[PDB]
Amino acid sequence: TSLSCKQCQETEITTKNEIFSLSLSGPMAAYVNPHGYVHETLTVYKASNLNLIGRPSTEHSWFPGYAWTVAQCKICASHIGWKFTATKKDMSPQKFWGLTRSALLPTI
Ligand SMILES: O=c1ccn(-c2cnc3c4c(ccn23)C2(CCNCC2)CO4)c(=O)[nH]1
Numbered sequence: 853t854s855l856s857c858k859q860c861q862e863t864e865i866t867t868k869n870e871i872f873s874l875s876l877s878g879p880m881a882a883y884v885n886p887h888g889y890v891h892e893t894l895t896v897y898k899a900s901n902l903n904l905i906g907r908p909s910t911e912h913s914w915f916p917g918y919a920w921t922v923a924q925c926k927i928c929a930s931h932i933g934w935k936f937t938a939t940k941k942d943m944s945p946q947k948f949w950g951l952t953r954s955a956l957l958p959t960i
């Protein structure tokens with residue numbers, strides 16, 4: 853139960869027992885960005901070895917209620933996913949992560 857950066861390979865990002873379904877039609881979804889490109893994601897509660905980058909934004913957020921910040925590998929600066937943060941106190945969970953499945957190992 854261990855998932856790692858695909859590019860540098862050594863770095864543990866998260867474990868499989870951190871996965872959860874917030875699509876509610878699965879933990880694994882696919883979302884389209886503004887330019888029309890499709891990203892196949894995986895929602896997890898917790899992840900580490902990630903440098904965040906930029907302010908949280910809600911421009912075209914895939915989870916309404918939440919804002920997204922870009923996330924990268926500490927080591928190789930490879931784009932892993934985004935971190936989602938709630939915009940009010942009442943929501944739950946308050947924060948989680950949406951990771952690119954094709955950026956992790958093993959890919960599932
Ligand atoms: O919830 C999410 C998570 C990530 N994204 C996302 C992934 N790639 C982009 C992206 C932009 C905005 C959002 N995203 C652009 C649009 C044009 N101006 C620069 C930013 C270019 O690439 C979301 O759209 N929603």
Ligand SMILES: [Zn+2]
Binds near residue numbers: 857858859
């Ligand atoms: Zn890496």
